[PDB]
Amino acid sequence: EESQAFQRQLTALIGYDVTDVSNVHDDELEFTRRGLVTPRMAEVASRDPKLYAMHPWVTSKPLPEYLWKKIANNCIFIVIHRSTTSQTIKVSPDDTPGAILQSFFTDFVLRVCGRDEYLVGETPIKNFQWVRHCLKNGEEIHVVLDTPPDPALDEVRKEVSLWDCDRKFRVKIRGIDIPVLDLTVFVEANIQHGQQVLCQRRTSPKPFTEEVLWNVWLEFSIKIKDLPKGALLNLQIYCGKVQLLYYVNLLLIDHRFLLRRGEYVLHMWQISSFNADKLTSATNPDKENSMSISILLDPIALPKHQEMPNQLRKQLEAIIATDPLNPLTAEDKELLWHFRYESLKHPKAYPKLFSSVKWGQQEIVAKTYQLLARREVWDQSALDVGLTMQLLDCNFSDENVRAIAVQKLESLEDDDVLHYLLQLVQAVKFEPYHDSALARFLLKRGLRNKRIGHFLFWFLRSEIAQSRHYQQRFAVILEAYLRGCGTAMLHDFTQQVQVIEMLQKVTLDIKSLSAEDVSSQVISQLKQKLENLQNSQLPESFRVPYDPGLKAGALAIEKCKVMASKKKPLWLEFKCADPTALSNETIGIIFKHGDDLRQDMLILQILRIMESIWETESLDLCLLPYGCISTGDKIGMIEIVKDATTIAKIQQSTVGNTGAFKDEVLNHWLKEKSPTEEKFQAAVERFVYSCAGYCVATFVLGIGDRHNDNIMITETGNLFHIDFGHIKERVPFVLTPDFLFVMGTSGKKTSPHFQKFQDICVKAYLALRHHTNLLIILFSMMLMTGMPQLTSKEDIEYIRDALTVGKNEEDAKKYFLDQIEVCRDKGWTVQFNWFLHLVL
Numbered sequence: 117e118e119s120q121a122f123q124r125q126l127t128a129l130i131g132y133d134v135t136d137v138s139n140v141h142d143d144e145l146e147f148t149r150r151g152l153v154t155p156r157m158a159e160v161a162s163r164d165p166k167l168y169a170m171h172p173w174v175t176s177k178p179l180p181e182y183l184w185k186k187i188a189n190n191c192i193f194i195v196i197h198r199s200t201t202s203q204t205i206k207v208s209p210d211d212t213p214g215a216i217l218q219s220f221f222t223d224f225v226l227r228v229c230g231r232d233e234y235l236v237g238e239t240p241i242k243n244f245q246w247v248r249h250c251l252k253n254g255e256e257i258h259v260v261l262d263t264p265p266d267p268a269l270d271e272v273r274k275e276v277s278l279w280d281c282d283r284k285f286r287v288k289i290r291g292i293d294i295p296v297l298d299l300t301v302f303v304e305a306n307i308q309h310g311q312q313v314l315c316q317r318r319t320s321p322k323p324f325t326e327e328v329l330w331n332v333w334l335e336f337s338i339k340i341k342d343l344p345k346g347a348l349l350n351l352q353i354y355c356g357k358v359q360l361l362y363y364v365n366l367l368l369i370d371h372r373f374l375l376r377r378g379e380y381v382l383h384m385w386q387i388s389s390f391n392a393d394k395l396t397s398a399t400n401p402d403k404e405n406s407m408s409i410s411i412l413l414d415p416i417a418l419p420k421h422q423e424m425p426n427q428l429r430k431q432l433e434a435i436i437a438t439d440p441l442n443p444l445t446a447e448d449k450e451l452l453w454h455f456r457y458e459s460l461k462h463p464k465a466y467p468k469l470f471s472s473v474k475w476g477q478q479e480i481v482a483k484t485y486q487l488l489a490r491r492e493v494w495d496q497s498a499l500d501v502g503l504t505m506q507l508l509d510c511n512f513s514d515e516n517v518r519a520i521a522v523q524k525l526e527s528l529e530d531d532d533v534l535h536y537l538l539q540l541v542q543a544v545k546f547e548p549y550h551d552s553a554l555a556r557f558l559l560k561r562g563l564r565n566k567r568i569g570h571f572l573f574w575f576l577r578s579e580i581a582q583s584r585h586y587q588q589r590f591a592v593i594l595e596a597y598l599r600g601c602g603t604a605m606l607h608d609f610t611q612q613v614q615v616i617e618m619l620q621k622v623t624l625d626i627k628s629l630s631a632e633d634v635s636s637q638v639i640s641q642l643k644q645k646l647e648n649l650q651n652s653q654l655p656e657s658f659r660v661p662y663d664p665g666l667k668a669g670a671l672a673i674e675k676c677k678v679m680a681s682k683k684k685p686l687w688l689e690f691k692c693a694d695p696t697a698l699s700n701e702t703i704g705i706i707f708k709h710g711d712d713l714r715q716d717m718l719i720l721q722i723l724r725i726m727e728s729i730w731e732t733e734s735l736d737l738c739l740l741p742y743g744c745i746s747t748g749d750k751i752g753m754i755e756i757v758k759d760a761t762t763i764a765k766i767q768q769s770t771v772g773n774t775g776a777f778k779d780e781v782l783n784h785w786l787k788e789k790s791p792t793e794e795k796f797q798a799a800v801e802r803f804v805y806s807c808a809g810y811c812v813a814t815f816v817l818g819i820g821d822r823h824n825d826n827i828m829i830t831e832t833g834n835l836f837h838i839d840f841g842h843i844k845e846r847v848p849f850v851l852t853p854d855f856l857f858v859m860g861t862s863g864k865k866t867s868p869h870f871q872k873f874q875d876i877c878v879k880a881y882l883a884l885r886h887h888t889n890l891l892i893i894l895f896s897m898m899l900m901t902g903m904p905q906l907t908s909k910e911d912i913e914y915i916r917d918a919l920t921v922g923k924n925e926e927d928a929k930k931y932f933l934d935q936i937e938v939c940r941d942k943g944w945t946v947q948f949n950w951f952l953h954l955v956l
């Protein structure tokens with residue numbers, strides 16, 4: 117009974133009932149649940165309860181040069197508090213927490229004031245992110261003396277060979293049936309491995325009535341022994357002049373290596389090119405409205421495995437050197453395959469090589485597995501995330517290839533997993549089976565670390581709530597996570613979900629009262645409902661989903677309001693529930709219903725990756741990739757950046773509601789907000805840096821052409837773009853006269869700052885180009901897994917151009933500087949055209 121009481125709880129947290137079997141035709145999901153018990157238990161049993169409880173967040177990356185020149189001679193100050201009054205201590209960057217706490221005593225723990233963050237463990241204090249964060253923002257390091265939190269609070273509650281068959285594969289299409297609906301229609305059946313169609317066959321076209329039967333056998337040209345694991349039977353329905361209307365898939369070799377035998381009635385998905393959704397094995401849960409198809413397959417199990425010319429070498433290195441979106445010809449494929457063993461010596465050749473394997477040919481695949489047996493150089497090579505990500509995309513449906521990718525991820529430190537976690541979670545969509553090396557890796561790295569675990573929960577939950585194609589798989593994975601994270605995390609997750617459920621309701625009802633124009637009489641209505649839920653049943657405190665170290669407390673009803681938008685998001689502000697906080701600042705969260713926030717998360721995360729890339733080359737570009745977390749179906753939270761205003765408003769306040777935009781206004785605003793000329797120029801510099809990073813970052817992603825109401829700036833000079841969910845003469849990015857004036861330029865001039873801006877942009881751009889392959893992959897995956905409305909080849913090939921693939925550096929500078937100049941030329945014309953468009 118209580119075990120079922122625990123399952124009800126799990127289900128509430130996941131947002132999907134995992135025990136259900138109403139939408140399966142096999143036991144793969146249930147088999148995967150039993151399969152993940154072991155790796156879960158293993159990781160739960162092997163994790164240090166102490167370090168797990170305090171989750172020290174640390175890095176082994178070198179302290180960047182920009183954070184070095186902010187330390188006054190190998191010394192940092194660490195203010196230690198107790199009851200109220202605060203003693204200060206001098207420390208060197210290399211002092212371990214215990215060493216600093218030993219210095220003080222002439223057992224307790226150092227906790228960061230206001231946060232559930234801890235400076236504990238065998239690493240120097242220059243190696244904690246909270247310290248580097250305090251350094252970057254020119255801030256002081258305040259910590260309390262505290263008891264370690266009890267590990268009892270994290271306690272988890274204990275608990276015929278296929279290769280002897282030369283028969284061609286065939287499938288019987290009995291017919292299709294739609295419940296509701298004059299043209300004709302046919303069924304197309306594809307044997308696929310990844311994006312490759314191995315063999316294709318159609319039925320003959322019949323009239324599209326609410327029931328169409330065929331009773332036809334489609335013999336394929338492929339032999340049953342030649343079926344590779346992860347082969348999908350992809351059934352599609354066309355009509356006409358031709359158009360695809362429905363699709364469904366079925367793994368031909370199941371999870372227990374058995375060939376698929378018997379009667380199936382598969383409920384299909386509708387269409388609204390390369391969408392991750394097209395690859396799913398999930399059938400449509402909506403039995404009542406959806407099309408279905410009926411088929412027949414006729415105990416076969418699949419067995420398991422055990423000096424060139426100059427011209428050709430060059431030709432092979434030319435191929436190996438190309439980008440991931442450069443299509444390989446048959447000549448190139450045949451070359452790579454013929455020179456198999458020479459290509460294996462180059463890690464960079466792996467994606468291309470494994471794309472040259474004829475996967476519908478049992479002996480070739482065998483030789484490929486032989487080849488994978490001899491992977492000494494790969495195993496030895498340093499971790500290349502870009503290369504590793506390529507092997508986890510839609511082009512690779514073979515487990516053994518994919519496993520060598522995950523093999524390399526094992527060596528990622530917890531800092532790096534957090535950088536790539538979102539996209540690793542999305543790559544699960546390209547896995548043929550519910551149980552995968554990648555799925556388990558995410559499981560153990562999550563269970564090993566509360567911060568990875570926190571974000572894994574939300575990322576998974578976000579997909580479970582707004583994707584029917586993959587919710588089943590992600591629900592199995594998240595169930596496995598929650599069954600080992602511990603009772604404390606379970607309580608946190610419960611609190612967080614409760615709060616966001618309470619806020620959703622208040623949002624839906626507020627949206628209903630308004631005419632889409634936001635009256636202040638409605639802002640009284642909002643304040644009423646917020647007060648109503650404050651006493652009961654809102655919880656005393658909750659972790660901020662996008663910043664888990666922070667606990668939000670009581671609402672500041674006074675400061676909450678309904679924002680002037682057509683989605684009417686809630687601007688909310690909370691007090692911090694932690695009294696040891698030594699600030700008054702509220703915690704600002706925008707709560708929005710109406711849009712899928714996943715796209716936003718993806719761009720923001722790519723921005724974080726771009727930052728770290730730049731850190732490798734000691735460049736800081738002061739981007740503000742603010743917190744943004746999808747929390748359920750078309751709902752989520754966004755962090756409110758403090759002391760921030762839009763560029764639009766700075767114009768509107770001086771100039772008025774008119775497009776008569778003025779060059780001087782921003783610099784004036786910055787001058788007025790800067791109290792001192794030293795703080796001013798620092799703000800101006802921050803702006804030159806910020807502006808350069810957003811110019812480069814948005815060019816590469818093709819999101820630089822924006823209305824300046826979607827660009828903001830802080831009172832300390834920090835420019836940042838907002839609201840990426842959305843997405844004539846154009847512009848590569850936003851570099852307007854107001855920005856140029858702040859730098860000391862107008863019309864056709866240059867300055868001390870402007871040349872430095874051009875300097876930073878060029879070095880920023882080139883630095884990204886040193887990771888072309890990585891960025892191309894994240895961009896392809898982003899499109900394929902997060903943006904259904906923008907997934908053609910030509911959409912993906914934007915980034916090839918943007919990154920000037922194949923060109924030398926010195927030319928690529930010339931390319932970027934032209935873009936800077938294509939802005940100069942246009943001044944206000946596009947911003948002005950944005951005013952005409954959006955305001956009217």
Ligand SMILES: COc1ncc(Nc2ncc([C@@H](C)N3CCN(S(C)(=O)=O)CC3)cc2-c2nc(C)nc(N)n2)cc1F
Nearest residue numbers: 679680685708716742754755756757760762825838839841
């Ligand atoms: C993905 O959806 C969103 N993404 C980002 C934001 N953030 C912001 N959106 C709009 C604004 C400006 C234009 N806003 C207009 C309305 N007024 S009002 C009179 O309704 O209160 C407030 C200012 C600002 C933000 C924003 N975003 C962040 C991250 N920080 C700050 N400070 N602001 C809001 C979203 F709904």
